[PDB]
Amino acid sequence: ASSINPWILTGFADAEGSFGLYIINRNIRYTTRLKFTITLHNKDKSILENIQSTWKVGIIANNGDNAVSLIVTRFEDLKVIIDHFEKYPLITQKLGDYKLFKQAFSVMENKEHLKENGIKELVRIKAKMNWGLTDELKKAFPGNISRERPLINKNIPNFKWLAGFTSGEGHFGVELIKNSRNSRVHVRLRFEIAQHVRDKNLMNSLITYLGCGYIYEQNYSERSWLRFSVSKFSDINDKIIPVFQENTLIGVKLEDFEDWCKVAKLIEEKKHLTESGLDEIKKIKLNMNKGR
DNA sequence: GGGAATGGCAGTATTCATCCACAATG
DNA sequence: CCATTGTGGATGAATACTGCCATTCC
Ligand SMILES: [Ca+2]
Ligand SMILES: [Ca+2]
Ligand SMILES: [Ca+2]
């Protein structure tokens, strides 16, 4: 119904989007499909409808029982996508996929995808995108087709990008701290953003960008990702809450953030060190995030 | 006529979000 | 002792990404 700010959109797409190139055999026996996909939980369908209304393109289809996808594949409508990301460009390593997506779009625009020479170029493009070439494409186009591509290294452009990106990757936690001495718990606010190590430079930059926090790496067990993490309450209350109050979040995570700010006000006013304050904080923790 | 383009999903794989422990710190 | 803060553990599902048959269009 409502349209999303374009820089929030790009932030959310850096978080949740996918740029795809699919090349399939007919058994001109290769057709090629170029596609932008956002797949979210059903609860955030309105995000997709809001992107769909901001672009005036794309279809929305259910994606199994619990998810839903916005899909742009119609060739003419991809110009809308490309226009958007030229004015408001991605900054994660996904930017490399979008560039390859754009390069493939030129091949198809010049009607070259249908010719043998075009297919071979599109195969080279697809090898560098996302998870690379399928086994069938590898059987049909043998050899070691290069997967290498330039590393993206861009800085956060503004807080509206951050807001869109955090709407996708962020976590606003109310955490109860247990101790050895007794059964009484304390409360801690946690802000986190997770991301694959491939964007280690962007993640590191959040420390200076937001003026607080840490990066932690987790390697459980042969997977690797990074955690931007903030727990110190003054940093939460003075540095994190203002940013996202000025730069509004989208989706259901907006509600979790608002419940988060409620707890933070209770902590700000020392109401959390009272049995009634803590009781209410517990109630909130139960009905947000995974409890919502 | 027919096959390319597009719709409409369901399926696969993993990168996230999320709740959590407990040591450290003052 | 209490309260806060640091440093991740662990888990599984909401993501990212892919696959395929049906319908539309040229
Ligand atoms: Ca992501
Ligand atoms: Ca998300
Ligand atoms: Ca995500």
Residues in Cβ contact with A195 at an 8 Å cutoff, skipping those fewer than 6 apart: A92, A169, A202, A203, A225, A226, A228
Task: Check residues 256 to 285 of chain A and report those whose beta carbon is under 7 Å from nucleic acid strand C.
Answer: 267, 272-273
Tally of CA atoms within 13 A in the half-sphere of A40 that contains its CB? 25
| A19's tokens | 């740029």
Q: Which nucleotides of B are covered by protein (CB under 7 A)?
A: 3-12, 14-24
Q: What are phi and psi of A89, to 5 degrees?
A: -80, 145
Distance CA A25, CA A31 (A): 7
Residues 216-245 of A with CB under 7 A from strand C: 216-220, 227, 229-234
Terminal C-alpha separation, chain A? 23
User: Would the Cβ of A10 be found within 7 angstroms of any atom in strand C?
Assistant: no
Q: Return the CATH number of the domain spanning residue range A1-138.
A: 3.10.28.10
Residues A78 and A21 sit within 8 Å (Cβ to Cβ)? no
Q: Where along chain A do the CATH 3.10.28.10 domains lie?
A: 1-138
Is A136 strand, coil or helix? helix
CA of A180 to C1' of B14 (A): 36
Phi, psi for residue A187 in degrees, rounded to 5: -125, 140
Check residue A112 and report its DSSP letter: G
A200 CA vs C11 C1’ separation (Å): 23
Q: Which nucleotide is nearest to A114 (CA to C1')?
A: B4
Task: Tell me which ligand sits closest to the C-alpha of residue A168.
Answer: 2
Please report, rounded to whole angstroms, the spatial distance between the CA atom of protein residue A50 and the C1' atom of nucleotide B16.
Answer: 23
CB atoms closer than 10 angstroms to residue A144:
7
Measure Cα distances from A108 to A32, A181, A210 in Å.
8, 68, 42
Stated in angstroms, how far is A51 CA from B3 C1'?
32
User: What is the Cβ-side half-sphere exposure of residue A134, based on CA atoms within 13 angstroms?
Assistant: 9
Sign of CA dihedral A130, A131, A134, A137: positive
Label residue A264 exposed, middle or buried (CB < 10 Å: 0-12, 13-18, 19+): buried
Strand partners, A18: A37
